[PDB]
Tab-separated table of C-alpha atoms (C1' of nucleotides) in Angstrom:
chain	number	residue	atom	x	y	z
A	1	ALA	CA	123.223	113.333	92.282
A	2	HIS	CA	124.389	116.031	89.881
A	3	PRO	CA	127.966	114.799	88.912
A	4	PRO	CA	128.412	112.846	85.683
A	5	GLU	CA	129.143	109.134	86.177
A	6	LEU	CA	132.553	109.690	84.492
A	7	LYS	CA	134.400	107.858	87.324
A	8	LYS	CA	134.973	104.753	85.130
A	9	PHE	CA	136.876	106.543	82.361
A	10	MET	CA	139.650	108.133	84.548
A	11	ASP	CA	143.342	107.377	83.723
A	12	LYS	CA	142.310	105.492	80.556
A	13	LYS	CA	143.128	107.140	77.263
A	14	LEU	CA	140.372	109.250	75.720
A	15	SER	CA	139.621	110.921	72.467
A	16	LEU	CA	137.352	113.958	72.509
A	17	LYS	CA	135.439	115.592	69.652
A	18	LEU	CA	134.908	119.270	70.417
A	19	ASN	CA	132.499	121.926	69.119
A	20	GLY	CA	133.433	123.504	65.804
A	21	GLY	CA	134.994	120.375	64.309
A	22	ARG	CA	138.030	120.056	66.573
A	23	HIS	CA	139.643	116.887	67.927
A	24	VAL	CA	141.984	116.226	70.902
A	25	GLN	CA	143.265	112.975	72.452
A	26	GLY	CA	144.142	112.551	76.050
A	27	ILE	CA	144.748	110.604	79.217
A	28	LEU	CA	142.090	111.841	81.603
A	29	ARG	CA	141.951	112.997	85.206
A	30	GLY	CA	139.284	115.529	86.060
A	31	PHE	CA	135.569	116.087	86.233
A	32	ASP	CA	133.271	118.458	88.090
A	33	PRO	CA	129.339	118.725	87.912
A	34	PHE	CA	129.531	120.760	84.675
A	35	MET	CA	131.750	118.019	83.037
A	36	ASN	CA	134.750	120.398	82.935
A	37	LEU	CA	137.574	117.966	82.146
A	38	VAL	CA	141.298	118.053	82.936
A	39	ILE	CA	143.211	116.192	80.231
A	40	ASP	CA	146.857	115.020	80.345
A	41	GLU	CA	149.382	114.223	77.567
A	42	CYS	CA	147.072	116.162	75.284
A	43	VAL	CA	147.586	116.117	71.504
A	44	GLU	CA	145.862	118.621	69.189
A	45	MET	CA	144.602	117.163	65.922
A	46	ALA	CA	144.764	119.967	63.340
A	47	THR	CA	142.689	119.880	60.105
A	48	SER	CA	145.662	118.829	57.933
A	49	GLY	CA	146.742	116.067	60.376
A	50	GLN	CA	149.792	118.113	61.420
A	51	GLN	CA	149.839	117.217	65.122
A	52	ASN	CA	150.911	119.396	68.059
A	53	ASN	CA	151.920	118.456	71.577
A	54	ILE	CA	150.514	120.640	74.403
A	55	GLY	CA	150.500	120.297	78.196
A	56	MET	CA	147.681	119.969	80.734
A	57	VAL	CA	144.454	121.741	79.656
A	58	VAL	CA	140.990	122.558	81.124
A	59	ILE	CA	137.923	122.100	78.897
A	60	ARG	CA	134.641	123.973	79.294
A	61	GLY	CA	131.710	121.556	79.767
A	62	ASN	CA	129.359	122.830	77.026
A	63	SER	CA	132.076	122.489	74.329
A	64	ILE	CA	131.886	118.655	74.297
A	65	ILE	CA	129.529	116.674	71.997
A	66	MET	CA	131.160	113.217	72.504
A	67	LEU	CA	133.796	111.558	74.741
A	68	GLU	CA	135.269	108.340	73.407
A	69	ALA	CA	137.749	105.828	74.847
A	70	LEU	CA	140.815	104.993	72.772
A	71	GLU	CA	141.737	102.217	75.234
A	72	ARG	CA	138.982	100.494	77.212
A	73	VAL	CA	137.670	101.064	80.716
B	1	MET	CA	110.952	115.669	92.446
B	2	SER	CA	108.740	115.659	89.286
B	3	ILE	CA	111.146	113.977	86.915
B	4	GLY	CA	108.310	113.089	84.538
B	5	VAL	CA	107.484	110.103	82.332
B	6	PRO	CA	110.029	110.456	79.374
B	7	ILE	CA	113.242	110.196	81.415
B	8	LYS	CA	111.813	107.152	83.263
B	9	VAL	CA	111.297	105.518	79.842
B	10	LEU	CA	114.939	106.406	79.079
B	11	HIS	CA	116.056	104.513	82.215
B	12	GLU	CA	113.697	101.713	81.077
B	13	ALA	CA	115.504	101.681	77.701
B	14	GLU	CA	118.959	100.651	79.163
B	15	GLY	CA	120.635	97.366	78.238
B	16	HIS	CA	118.907	97.271	74.808
B	17	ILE	CA	120.042	98.809	71.499
B	18	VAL	CA	119.197	102.444	70.719
B	19	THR	CA	119.994	104.853	67.890
B	20	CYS	CA	120.945	108.406	68.804
B	21	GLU	CA	121.517	111.466	66.616
B	22	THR	CA	123.583	114.518	67.603
B	23	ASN	CA	123.345	118.208	66.482
B	24	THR	CA	126.249	117.852	64.023
B	25	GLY	CA	124.482	115.046	62.116
B	26	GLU	CA	126.447	111.991	63.276
B	27	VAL	CA	124.190	108.965	63.844
B	28	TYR	CA	125.222	106.501	66.549
B	29	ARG	CA	123.841	102.972	66.938
B	30	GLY	CA	124.927	101.231	70.062
B	31	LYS	CA	124.009	99.278	73.148
B	32	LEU	CA	123.080	101.461	76.110
B	33	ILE	CA	124.701	100.984	79.518
B	34	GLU	CA	123.547	103.857	81.727
B	35	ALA	CA	121.669	107.110	81.249
B	36	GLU	CA	121.548	110.074	83.623
B	37	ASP	CA	118.696	112.430	84.567
B	38	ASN	CA	120.049	115.199	82.271
B	39	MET	CA	120.337	112.555	79.454
B	40	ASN	CA	124.106	112.000	79.536
B	41	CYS	CA	124.293	108.573	77.951
B	42	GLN	CA	127.062	106.057	77.980
B	43	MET	CA	126.896	103.754	74.963
B	44	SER	CA	128.737	100.563	74.032
B	45	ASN	CA	129.743	98.647	70.895
B	46	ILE	CA	128.672	101.254	68.378
B	47	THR	CA	128.338	101.375	64.580
B	48	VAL	CA	128.421	105.098	63.808
B	49	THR	CA	127.201	106.707	60.596
B	50	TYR	CA	129.054	109.931	59.793
B	51	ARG	CA	127.377	113.005	58.316
B	52	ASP	CA	128.710	112.308	54.801
B	53	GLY	CA	128.265	108.532	54.535
B	54	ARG	CA	131.148	106.629	56.138
B	55	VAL	CA	130.744	103.835	58.714
B	56	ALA	CA	133.028	103.118	61.693
B	57	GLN	CA	133.002	100.804	64.704
B	58	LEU	CA	133.805	102.010	68.234
B	59	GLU	CA	134.596	100.464	71.618
B	60	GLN	CA	132.767	102.786	74.089
B	61	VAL	CA	131.475	106.378	73.979
B	62	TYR	CA	129.849	108.902	76.364
B	63	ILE	CA	127.433	111.426	74.884
B	64	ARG	CA	126.731	114.765	76.647
B	65	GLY	CA	122.985	115.308	77.323
B	66	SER	CA	122.184	118.645	75.618
B	67	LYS	CA	123.997	117.528	72.413
B	68	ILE	CA	121.299	115.008	71.334
B	69	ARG	CA	118.257	115.726	69.218
B	70	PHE	CA	116.392	112.341	69.241
B	71	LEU	CA	116.753	108.760	70.386
B	72	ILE	CA	115.033	105.785	68.778
B	73	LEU	CA	113.931	103.708	71.739
B	74	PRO	CA	113.231	99.993	71.102
B	75	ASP	CA	109.557	99.491	70.249
B	76	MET	CA	108.621	96.845	72.901
B	77	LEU	CA	108.740	99.605	75.583
B	78	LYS	CA	105.288	100.853	74.403
B	79	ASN	CA	103.766	98.189	76.743
B	80	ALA	CA	105.896	99.309	79.823
B	81	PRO	CA	104.269	100.095	83.241
B	82	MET	CA	105.164	103.775	82.847
B	83	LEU	CA	102.349	103.863	80.267
C	1	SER	CA	99.437	121.846	81.104
C	2	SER	CA	95.685	121.599	80.469
C	3	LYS	CA	95.824	122.749	76.823
C	4	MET	CA	98.590	120.225	76.008
C	5	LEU	CA	96.820	117.377	77.887
C	6	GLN	CA	93.805	117.670	75.517
C	7	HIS	CA	96.015	116.458	72.648
C	8	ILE	CA	97.163	113.108	74.257
C	9	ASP	CA	96.941	109.802	72.214
C	10	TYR	CA	96.136	111.692	68.953
C	11	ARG	CA	98.387	111.693	65.863
C	12	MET	CA	100.557	114.805	66.133
C	13	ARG	CA	102.764	116.585	63.583
C	14	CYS	CA	105.951	118.191	64.956
C	15	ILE	CA	108.264	120.687	63.229
C	16	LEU	CA	111.853	120.511	64.483
C	17	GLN	CA	114.393	123.342	64.766
C	18	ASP	CA	116.364	122.332	61.654
C	19	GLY	CA	113.297	122.312	59.382
C	20	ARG	CA	112.492	118.557	59.533
C	21	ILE	CA	108.986	117.204	60.248
C	22	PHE	CA	107.933	114.253	62.425
C	23	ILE	CA	104.423	112.758	62.577
C	24	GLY	CA	103.701	110.525	65.532
C	25	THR	CA	101.223	109.184	68.069
C	26	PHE	CA	101.788	111.128	71.225
C	27	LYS	CA	102.089	109.656	74.728
C	28	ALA	CA	104.381	111.566	77.174
C	29	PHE	CA	105.344	115.171	77.994
C	30	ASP	CA	107.383	116.885	80.613
C	31	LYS	CA	108.172	120.308	82.180
C	32	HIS	CA	110.957	120.887	79.593
C	33	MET	CA	108.605	119.791	76.741
C	34	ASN	CA	110.362	116.533	76.138
C	35	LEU	CA	108.201	114.222	74.046
C	36	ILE	CA	107.638	110.594	73.249
C	37	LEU	CA	106.195	110.116	69.785
C	38	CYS	CA	105.153	106.626	68.692
C	39	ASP	CA	104.460	104.809	65.365
C	40	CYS	CA	106.279	107.647	63.746
C	41	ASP	CA	107.358	109.026	60.385
C	42	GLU	CA	110.190	111.318	59.336
C	43	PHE	CA	108.981	113.411	56.444
C	44	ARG	CA	110.783	115.979	54.261
C	45	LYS	CA	110.078	118.140	51.263
C	46	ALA	CA	107.541	118.697	41.028
C	47	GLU	CA	109.510	119.539	44.173
C	48	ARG	CA	110.813	116.216	45.541
C	49	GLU	CA	109.362	114.699	48.737
C	50	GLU	CA	110.207	111.668	50.855
C	51	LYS	CA	108.903	109.700	53.873
C	52	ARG	CA	111.108	107.728	56.309
C	53	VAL	CA	109.875	105.622	59.262
C	54	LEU	CA	111.102	105.885	62.889
C	55	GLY	CA	110.120	104.059	66.092
C	56	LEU	CA	109.292	105.394	69.596
C	57	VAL	CA	111.134	108.693	69.147
C	58	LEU	CA	112.263	110.584	72.279
C	59	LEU	CA	112.568	114.308	71.516
C	60	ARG	CA	114.883	116.411	73.714
C	61	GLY	CA	112.830	119.543	74.439
C	62	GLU	CA	115.248	122.165	72.976
C	63	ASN	CA	114.494	121.237	69.364
C	64	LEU	CA	110.702	121.676	69.345
C	65	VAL	CA	109.130	124.581	67.465
C	66	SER	CA	105.448	123.718	67.052
C	67	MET	CA	103.024	120.833	67.109
C	68	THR	CA	99.688	120.305	65.389
C	69	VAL	CA	96.799	117.826	65.310
C	70	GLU	CA	95.656	115.984	62.180
C	71	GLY	CA	93.896	112.800	63.071
C	72	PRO	CA	91.065	111.348	65.096
C	73	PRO	CA	92.652	109.097	67.799
C	74	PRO	CA	94.147	105.675	67.183
C	75	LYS	CA	91.456	104.714	69.725
C	76	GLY	CA	70.558	100.703	82.279
C	77	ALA	CA	67.421	100.353	84.386
C	78	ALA	CA	66.829	96.801	85.609
C	79	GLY	CA	64.400	94.280	84.165
C	80	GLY	CA	61.264	94.294	86.274
C	81	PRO	CA	58.715	91.868	87.733
C	82	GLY	CA	56.203	91.941	84.845
C	83	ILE	CA	55.339	88.878	82.759
C	84	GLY	CA	53.057	88.640	79.750
C	85	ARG	CA	50.972	85.578	78.968
C	86	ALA	CA	48.187	84.518	76.629
C	87	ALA	CA	44.732	84.893	78.191
C	88	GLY	CA	41.071	84.839	77.352
C	89	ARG	CA	38.697	87.592	78.465
C	90	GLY	CA	35.446	85.890	79.516
C	91	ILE	CA	32.233	87.922	79.365
C	92	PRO	CA	30.306	88.283	82.643
C	93	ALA	CA	26.646	87.350	82.806
C	94	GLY	CA	24.368	90.185	81.764
D	1	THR	CA	108.417	112.089	120.104
D	2	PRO	CA	109.706	109.919	122.980
D	3	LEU	CA	111.110	106.420	122.447
D	4	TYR	CA	108.594	105.057	124.952
D	5	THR	CA	105.536	106.232	126.867
D	6	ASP	CA	103.876	104.712	129.945
D	7	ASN	CA	101.346	102.826	127.767
D	8	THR	CA	104.133	101.240	125.639
D	9	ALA	CA	105.046	98.660	128.307
D	10	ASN	CA	101.414	97.623	128.814
D	11	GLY	CA	100.347	97.875	125.160
D	12	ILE	CA	102.941	95.398	123.840
D	13	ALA	CA	101.717	92.802	126.393
D	14	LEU	CA	98.238	92.672	124.798
D	15	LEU	CA	99.709	91.168	121.574
D	16	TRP	CA	99.997	87.713	123.189
D	17	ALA	CA	96.850	87.916	125.323
D	18	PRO	CA	94.213	85.192	124.675
D	19	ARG	CA	91.645	85.542	121.892
D	20	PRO	CA	89.067	88.080	123.313
D	21	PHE	CA	91.664	90.318	124.958
D	22	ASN	CA	94.164	90.748	122.108
D	23	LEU	CA	91.868	92.868	119.894
D	24	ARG	CA	90.586	96.442	119.841
D	25	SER	CA	87.208	95.604	118.311
D	26	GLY	CA	84.963	92.613	117.837
D	27	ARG	CA	81.326	91.654	117.859
D	28	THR	CA	79.199	90.964	120.921
D	29	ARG	CA	78.285	87.398	121.859
D	30	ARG	CA	75.475	85.825	123.825
D	31	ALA	CA	76.153	85.063	127.499
D	32	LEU	CA	75.343	81.428	126.613
D	33	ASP	CA	78.161	81.064	124.134
D	34	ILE	CA	81.270	82.128	126.132
D	35	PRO	CA	82.874	79.009	127.698
D	36	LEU	CA	84.422	80.524	130.854
D	37	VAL	CA	86.103	77.338	132.158
D	38	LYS	CA	87.140	75.871	128.766
D	39	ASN	CA	90.866	76.783	128.947
D	40	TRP	CA	91.427	74.715	132.118
D	41	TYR	CA	90.412	71.204	131.023
D	42	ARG	CA	92.152	71.492	127.615
D	43	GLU	CA	95.548	71.308	129.400
D	44	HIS	CA	96.896	68.126	131.020
D	45	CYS	CA	96.632	69.159	134.688
D	46	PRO	CA	99.362	68.127	137.219
D	47	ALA	CA	98.934	64.450	138.208
D	48	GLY	CA	99.271	64.968	142.023
D	49	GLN	CA	95.534	65.835	142.058
D	50	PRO	CA	93.156	62.980	143.144
D	51	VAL	CA	92.098	60.185	140.721
D	52	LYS	CA	88.443	61.391	140.681
D	53	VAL	CA	89.151	64.717	138.947
D	54	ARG	CA	91.663	63.286	136.375
D	55	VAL	CA	88.934	61.111	134.837
D	56	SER	CA	86.568	64.130	135.055
D	57	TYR	CA	89.077	66.150	132.977
D	58	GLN	CA	89.418	63.325	130.425
D	59	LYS	CA	85.650	62.856	130.029
D	60	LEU	CA	85.253	66.581	129.281
D	61	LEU	CA	87.575	66.222	126.279
D	62	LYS	CA	85.443	63.356	124.867
D	63	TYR	CA	82.328	65.509	124.402
D	64	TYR	CA	84.467	68.388	123.068
D	65	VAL	CA	86.077	66.252	120.322
D	66	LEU	CA	82.769	64.597	119.281
D	67	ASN	CA	80.994	67.958	118.864
D	68	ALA	CA	83.697	69.546	116.681
D	69	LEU	CA	84.086	66.339	114.643
D	70	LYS	CA	80.399	65.826	113.868
D	71	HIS	CA	79.851	69.552	113.206
D	72	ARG	CA	78.201	70.193	109.854
D	73	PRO	CA	77.874	73.751	108.412
D	74	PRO	CA	74.464	75.484	108.582
D	75	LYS	CA	72.088	74.486	105.782
D	76	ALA	CA	71.292	78.150	104.726
D	77	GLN	CA	67.718	77.743	106.029
D	78	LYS	CA	65.429	80.722	105.425
D	79	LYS	CA	64.953	83.174	108.296
D	80	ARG	CA	61.600	83.122	110.097
D	81	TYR	CA	61.236	85.027	113.366
D	82	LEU	CA	58.699	83.406	115.713
D	83	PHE	CA	57.996	86.204	118.236
D	84	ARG	CA	57.764	88.832	115.477
D	85	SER	CA	54.959	86.797	113.875
D	86	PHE	CA	53.251	86.708	117.302
D	87	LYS	CA	53.546	90.422	118.134
D	88	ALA	CA	52.239	91.368	114.644
D	89	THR	CA	48.844	90.000	115.851
D	90	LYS	CA	46.180	91.780	117.950
D	91	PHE	CA	46.291	89.019	120.626
D	92	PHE	CA	49.799	89.959	121.857
D	93	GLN	CA	51.105	93.083	123.606
D	94	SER	CA	54.477	94.075	125.034
D	95	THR	CA	55.847	95.754	128.180
D	96	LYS	CA	58.942	96.031	130.397
D	97	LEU	CA	59.015	94.000	133.613
D	98	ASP	CA	61.339	92.846	136.394
D	99	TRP	CA	62.734	89.352	135.697
D	100	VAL	CA	61.542	88.142	139.127
D	101	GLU	CA	57.967	89.224	138.314
D	102	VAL	CA	57.984	87.331	134.990
D	103	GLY	CA	59.493	84.233	136.644
D	104	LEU	CA	56.593	84.011	139.089
D	105	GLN	CA	54.119	84.531	136.210
D	106	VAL	CA	55.589	81.670	134.111
D	107	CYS	CA	55.373	79.354	137.128
D	108	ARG	CA	51.793	80.510	137.835
D	109	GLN	CA	50.865	80.064	134.139
D	110	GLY	CA	52.580	76.655	133.841
D	111	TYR	CA	50.762	75.482	136.981
E	1	G	C1'	73.485	111.669	107.813
E	2	U	C1'	73.517	108.315	112.659
E	3	U	C1'	70.325	105.136	115.310
E	4	U	C1'	65.728	101.941	115.546
E	5	C	C1'	61.491	98.657	113.874
E	6	U	C1'	59.234	95.678	110.105
E	7	C	C1'	59.312	93.108	105.359
E	8	U	C1'	61.693	90.713	100.968
E	9	U	C1'	65.907	88.016	98.859
E	10	C	C1'	70.775	85.286	98.817
E	11	A	C1'	73.807	82.553	102.040
E	12	G	C1'	79.673	80.248	99.495
E	13	A	C1'	81.509	81.234	105.053
E	14	U	C1'	84.851	78.481	112.454
E	15	C	C1'	76.921	81.366	108.367
E	16	G	C1'	78.407	80.175	115.374
E	17	C	C1'	86.487	80.867	118.196
E	18	A	C1'	79.615	78.173	120.626
E	19	U	C1'	76.969	73.468	120.737
E	20	A	C1'	71.253	70.577	121.376
E	21	A	C1'	67.465	67.059	120.048
E	22	A	C1'	64.636	64.004	116.503
E	23	U	C1'	63.746	60.416	112.215
E	24	C	C1'	65.566	56.381	108.973
E	25	U	C1'	69.318	52.580	107.451
E	26	U	C1'	73.115	49.415	109.496
E	27	U	C1'	76.847	47.321	113.177
E	28	C	C1'	76.562	46.654	118.373
E	29	G	C1'	74.755	46.249	124.435
E	30	C	C1'	71.551	45.460	128.683
E	31	C	C1'	67.738	42.967	127.299
E	32	U	C1'	60.146	38.732	128.455
E	33	U	C1'	57.998	42.939	125.491
E	34	U	C1'	57.941	48.275	123.894
E	35	U	C1'	59.153	53.196	124.744
E	36	A	C1'	62.979	55.624	127.120
E	37	C	C1'	68.223	53.861	125.723
E	38	U	C1'	73.659	52.739	124.708
E	39	A	C1'	77.764	54.350	121.015
E	40	A	C1'	79.880	54.464	116.416
E	41	A	C1'	78.989	55.335	110.962
E	42	G	C1'	75.993	57.406	107.022
E	43	A	C1'	71.769	59.988	104.979
E	44	U	C1'	68.578	63.436	106.931
E	45	U	C1'	65.409	67.212	109.216
E	46	U	C1'	63.910	70.340	113.589
E	47	C	C1'	65.482	74.146	117.087
E	48	C	C1'	68.758	78.462	119.591
E	49	G	C1'	71.304	82.159	117.088
E	50	U	C1'	74.011	84.982	112.426
E	51	G	C1'	75.950	87.693	108.045
E	52	G	C1'	75.306	90.428	102.979
E	53	A	C1'	71.967	93.355	99.882
E	54	G	C1'	67.341	95.897	98.987
E	55	A	C1'	62.410	98.274	100.283
E	56	G	C1'	59.442	101.027	103.793
E	57	G	C1'	58.342	103.383	108.458
E	58	A	C1'	59.774	105.862	113.070
E	59	A	C1'	63.234	109.024	116.373
E	60	C	C1'	67.022	112.553	116.949
E	61	A	C1'	70.366	115.573	113.972
E	62	C	C1'	110.541	130.510	91.775
E	63	C	C1'	115.724	130.715	89.769
E	64	A	C1'	118.502	134.927	82.525
E	65	A	C1'	125.547	131.905	84.196
E	66	U	C1'	127.589	125.487	80.629
E	67	U	C1'	122.633	120.074	81.610
E	68	U	C1'	116.800	122.129	78.053
E	69	U	C1'	112.632	128.002	78.519
E	70	U	C1'	115.803	134.557	78.033
E	71	U	C1'	119.293	131.448	72.150
E	72	G	C1'	126.375	131.007	68.193
E	73	A	C1'	123.074	134.496	66.017
E	74	G	C1'	123.378	135.866	61.220
E	75	C	C1'	126.228	136.097	56.308
E	76	C	C1'	128.458	134.165	52.103
E	77	U	C1'	131.078	130.434	47.916
E	78	U	C1'	131.140	125.470	45.203
E	79	G	C1'	128.566	121.240	42.911
E	80	C	C1'	123.978	119.233	41.333
E	81	C	C1'	118.684	120.232	40.855
E	82	U	C1'	114.561	122.605	34.749
E	83	U	C1'	113.336	125.990	38.581
E	84	G	C1'	112.445	125.662	43.670
E	85	G	C1'	115.997	123.858	46.970
E	86	C	C1'	119.332	119.918	48.491
E	87	A	C1'	124.519	118.056	49.719
E	88	A	C1'	127.790	120.648	51.991
E	89	G	C1'	131.991	123.897	52.704
E	90	G	C1'	133.805	128.596	54.556
E	91	C	C1'	133.159	132.797	57.548
E	92	U	C1'	132.742	136.594	60.838
RNA sequence: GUUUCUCUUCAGAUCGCAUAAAUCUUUCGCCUUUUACUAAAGAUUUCCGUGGAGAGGAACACCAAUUUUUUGAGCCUUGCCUUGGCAAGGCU
């Protein structure tokens, strides 16, 4: 079927690497057929390593180019 | 439906060791686990080469389909009953 | 289809979107122009020039620009009842 | 399409019919070769029948076993058709006659 | 093209979902003698039929909305590289 087999990764702690050289790290709970993610406890990794905290975020599917686990399935 | 010969060879590739290069220029080298019909791969136990030289090891990774621009499938597959 | 199918099993040269070149022996293609190249070289350009080797390369269709040929491929009626034998002639009388 | 049709009840029952009846197609045999009474004496008939027939059953099995034991395959002997060789010759002719007419003729000839 | 008839060749096959007789060598039995026998084995042939192949005759005849194909394009600055360009980096 069309959904990504992302079911494994849920509630484990992800890093993402986003289009345009951006990085965010997250505990995950969402996916839909386009891979639109809903990330929780989401940190923004700025260029300089000055880190922000931000709340729950949606991501557009096409913006992702990798999706990595910081703590295992 | 006519999902042709290449994606079947991708499913055939699973459980081996494949190399996989993304738009940005990062080169991954990892053991495959599953691959979907739009080429979303999961990959395990990777040694990644960065664009500028550096190596790193990784636990597990999932690589969006449209973001790839080759895989290096393991040569023994040339015999496979898809071909 | 039919124009592409003529090329199969030859040694094909592909030019990717980024400017790279692959040269490979060609055995798969698909409605999105995915490819499988085999026994394959990665090749880049006195202006310096270089030649790397790759195996069994699977090309996601989006990248492809063009492909070209330059190689030849990495590739009665039954016996009848007659018998001959040595013979003399023998003249008849008269 | 319906779960069953009127032929379904009958048609299943053919699957365990004896050897000539359980098939849709076969090859024709000679009237000589079909052993019409064979199935009876191959089964141990109920003993309340008189002594006389019991031994008659048993002695039918004896000739059955001996034939199938001493059977040897055919020797691949070359075909040679007798009556064809006859009717190829000017001395023979052919026609279509009642069996009772021919029977009288063979007895008249043999006499 | 379907039937038919004839010929040639090979048969490994339940060539047969059926089942005959003959010869020889032995073991037997009634037995003056011999056929005709008996009933088991083995080697053998004959006969009733069969299949495969080939030859020839005859008779009737569809979608531009993220996952590929209707595009994030395109533009600059640094180092090297003799030049060409490459490694990038930064932009809108």
